[PDB]
Amino acid sequence: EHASRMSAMENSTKSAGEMLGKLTLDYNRKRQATITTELIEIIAGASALM
Amino acid sequence: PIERQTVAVYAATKGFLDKVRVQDIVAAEEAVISQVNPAVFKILKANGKITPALDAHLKAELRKVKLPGA
Amino acid sequence: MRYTIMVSATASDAAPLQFLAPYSGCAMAEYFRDTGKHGLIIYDDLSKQSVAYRQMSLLLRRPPGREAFPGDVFYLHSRLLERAAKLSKELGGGSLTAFPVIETQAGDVSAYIATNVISITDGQIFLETELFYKGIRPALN
Amino acid sequence: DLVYRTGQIVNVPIGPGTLGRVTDGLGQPIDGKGPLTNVRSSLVEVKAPGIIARQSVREPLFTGVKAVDALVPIGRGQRELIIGDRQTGKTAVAIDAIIHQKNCNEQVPKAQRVYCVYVAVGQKRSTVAQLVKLFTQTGAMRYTIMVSATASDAAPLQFLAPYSGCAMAEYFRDTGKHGLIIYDDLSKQSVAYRQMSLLLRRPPGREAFPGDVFYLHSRLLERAAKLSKELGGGSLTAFPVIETQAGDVSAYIATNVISITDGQIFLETELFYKGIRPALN
Amino acid sequence: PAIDAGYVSQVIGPVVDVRFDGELPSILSSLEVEGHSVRLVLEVAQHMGDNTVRCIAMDSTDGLVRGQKVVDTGSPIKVPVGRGTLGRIMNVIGEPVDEQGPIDAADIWSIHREAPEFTEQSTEQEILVTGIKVVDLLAPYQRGGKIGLFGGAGVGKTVLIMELINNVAKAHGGFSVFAGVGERTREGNDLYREMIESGVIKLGAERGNSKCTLVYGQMNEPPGARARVALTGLTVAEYFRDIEGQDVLLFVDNIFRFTQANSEVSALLGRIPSAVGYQPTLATDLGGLQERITTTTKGSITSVQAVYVPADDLTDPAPATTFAHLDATTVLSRSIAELGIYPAVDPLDSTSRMLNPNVIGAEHYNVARGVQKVLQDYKNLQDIIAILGMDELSEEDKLTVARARKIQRFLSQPFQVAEVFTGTPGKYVDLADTISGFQGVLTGKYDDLPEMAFYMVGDIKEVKEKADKMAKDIASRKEADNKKVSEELKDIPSLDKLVSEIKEVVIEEDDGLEEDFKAEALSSETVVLNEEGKSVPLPKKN
Amino acid sequence: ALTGLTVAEYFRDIEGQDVLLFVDNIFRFTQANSEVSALLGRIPSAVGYQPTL
Amino acid sequence: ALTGLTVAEYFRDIEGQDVLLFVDNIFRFTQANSEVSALLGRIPSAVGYQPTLATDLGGLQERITTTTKGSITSVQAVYVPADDLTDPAPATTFAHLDATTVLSR
């Protein structure tokens, strides 16, 4: 039981390291998309005035 | 060339390389295309298909190649 | 339909007709509030009035804001939904209760028009699409 | 400064004198071998052939790559995307196709040969120079045109270098011969077009790209067609290359060209570093 | 002659400004530029003031000079409509592009209509069975309703819309219209050669027995042509609905390209852009087009539209606007397709107004909501199964996982149009075979069978006949030792004379590309035009 | 919010008293200045507020 | 960084040598060209970089090459913003890099 738990939790660190590695990517895609989207909202509001 | 790719896949999908260990398959297919006589590639290129005449001479020529290791 | 009025500025109508149809329908419903009766107004797709108002304001060349909405898009819905009241006895005692409908995108309640109408209205009836598929209908969170 | 009009829409030299020549994004040669001799000028911006002008893709284009010719087979007239991360073998699939056409052109008859165009958009000028040395020491340069708008060239030159090279490749399609065009990093052509659009103060859309960045690549890739029998029957095969970031193929330009081209060759970065080369997903 | 003729004022890509000295055309009026290389039709979009209209070109504007004569047609873009358009390909401005001669028009209709009024709406929800298991069960299609196929570039919404053409258009008695809007021209030639082989389109003297009109504005066209070719495709369908009284099928491949091509245009019309970068008039442009595709009291249009979601973003403003215009959405998922399940339909994102127990019967409805119940319960377990495995679920939830892993293979189905590139033949599944088949996986009648027996089969008969074949095959490893004996003398000659019966190809040196080549003499220095218009070299100054 | 603060500043300064000022949603002071901000002709700052927030 | 290349290009083109060129934080080259582009009123590209980001980097990095007379080899210290390699400033820089030397703590 202690040796199947030692292997079922090695399978859980890499499953929660593959899940974390994939969530780090789409956060970074949503991070870059946020800085692009908020900045396009500022230029569109400044080009209406300038 | 496409006629030497299809013989290398015929050597692998049929099972003529099952004895070869996975470390030496890049050496095995290089030994397949070199040791199988080059007239069988002119048949497969010109006929454009593995004809039922040709797969017999293919399977004859594929059992007499010296695969490395194994 | 004996008790119902239906105001419908549909999708083919001009953008100032969909912008004005919550106000047109509220004025029809305020007849019952201002005469001692009770009204019930449903602004179905109040998320689509704000898009129609955004089209007018961007084409009147008013400068855009959050998600290119006008700055006064809170006041678009706050002055509409404050007209739903319960009047006093000296004004008849009539009432008007409003059901604005807002559609979110992937459950993003933090959207711009959704943030405004949540802070304007009294209650919320949140309907989640994952509770809808577990058999819970109405999908009330 | 005085601006003179030349009298004609934007044109490049097309013809049999373009074979063997390295060329910038506008037509004029950069390899230092003199002007283009046996050549004539045609437009870079031609409308693609219509519905009747095409026929079904029937004939195979052998890449010489085993994982391509077995698993992802490519016909003459097709547009096939090569998509993957940086350094996953995207150029090597593309330049194995050009080299293999040199081997096949010496055995097929005259009207079955494939003439290649390699458009290098936004590349290093050294990697373009190391590529002409590869195509010369192979003998592939006899059937290859090389268009190159490198990373130091101006952004209108990188935007136009695919259209310049397509017009040089549409010479072979329109005369019954067979063409093979490779737009290496079509991702670097939309970035150069995003530069021209934001400097023209056009409203940016998703990922600050213009609205017509789909039409940038759709207009280009629709010109790779298999023509009908009353138009010579010649073809043009496109291999656009898209570099993805961290294997994300739901990006804007990646999903644009996926919805333009016929198939894809996803080169996975995990297989490439596990020794599996070509790293075909 | 001098009046009623404007001159080109300014050219900004696909947007042309024309100044009319005497009298201005109406908005939506179509104009003609004299002396272009092709027929260039401009459509008046805005009155800019100072006697200038702002127009959208229907072909390319390259080669337009700022004085060119533009004449007013006094009407909008008028296309030929009628039974004479059957079996013909038209482009956006009604020209025949199929090289079969002119179109024998019953009428020339304007492509701009008002949508039909409120009193001309029909409230009659009848089912349209498509033979597709995930469509017939979870989001059934209305016989005269608007249908959307939402997809993300490579998930299968052209293969699904071709299977709907394969399944419902032959069984329909009326006329189909295909509006190819902004798609590949290779697919427009694939569909044309398919419909000629299938006899849907007949050429020449039998042209009147055609049942389909193709209208094609594909992705090689400029954005003005892609913005109006959906309006051309409706007008052919609106004639059969209104005048002919027919039941029309309208297939619109990528209605998103209508919205996209209005965004490449509105940047140059001088508008402030709305959210993500689209035009401010997105919802009323799409609502102006989508409200014309209806069932009225004098005819029905069963429209199936493919909708492209731009970067697999369903919250993008162009797919999100389209969702409110449809009776049945079929959202296709990129992650379902990566499992290999085809059609890649999300069962928990596809909806229909027909999935109502008073319309489809309470027995079909209850097994749809039970199928969606266990697929949502499997989705609630998706990260516990990821980070902890299936070993820690309950014994009543491991039955939830195993059943939902079976019905999401059993929603998969092979298509008759995918049989070319998959090899497996297509399966049309009847409606009652789907409702009875999905009762069985819910109740527990098929907990015996493996998961992969349900994958890519038609009926619940075919999963039993595949569960046997999966166990005949693991017994077939012990079957027999295949030996090929004594065949070298029966009919196979040799290898050496098999070389001598190939034909040697005449390989030609000197490739000879100087055949019919004109080779104009490009000189060294840049030839320019001087002030008298002559071709002179560049002067030497800076 | 300045009208009610002026009443509270009279009771503090002139009456000398201790005042309790209750402001329900001081957020709406900043929100209302944003609804007029681009119409006073100033380009917006971060998330959508006026530059003078 | 162009003042540094010019001193390096004299030793490449006139002295005919193999020059090293150290660009300490090539990201601060990118960030400063992003600021010049913003002060000239240009519309920012994706995440907020200059529209000319690939050709301002590319105009620098294409002068670092080996010619027939000499060579210039560049060792460029690379900073990665938010440790995001798909950020357009390292992703554009990584298209020019011929090697990578990671120094670890």
Ligand SMILES: Nc1ncnc2c1ncn2[C@@H]1O[C@H](COP(=O)(O)OP(=O)(O)OP(=O)(O)O)[C@@H](O)[C@H]1O
């Ligand atoms: N099939 C292969 N077998 C062995 N090595 C290979 C193979 N293909 C590519 N390589 C090597 O791996 C590297 C990949 O470079 P390549 O240019 O092919 O990839 P790329 O994606 O085009 O890169 P870039 O983004 O720099 O253009 C090269 O150094 C090449 O020599």
Ligand SMILES: Nc1ncnc2c1ncn2[C@@H]1O[C@H](COP(=O)(O)OP(=O)(O)O)[C@@H](O)[C@H]1O
């Ligand atoms: N029903 C299906 N069966 C098998 N493969 C499919 C199916 N639908 C789609 N595909 C695969 O998905 C790809 C996308 O097809 P298509 O519909 O042309 O793309 P899009 O949806 O982007 O228009 C096809 O090349 C095909 O390989």
Ligand SMILES: [Mg+2]
């Ligand atoms: Mg490359």
Ligand SMILES: [Mg+2]
């Ligand atoms: Mg499609």
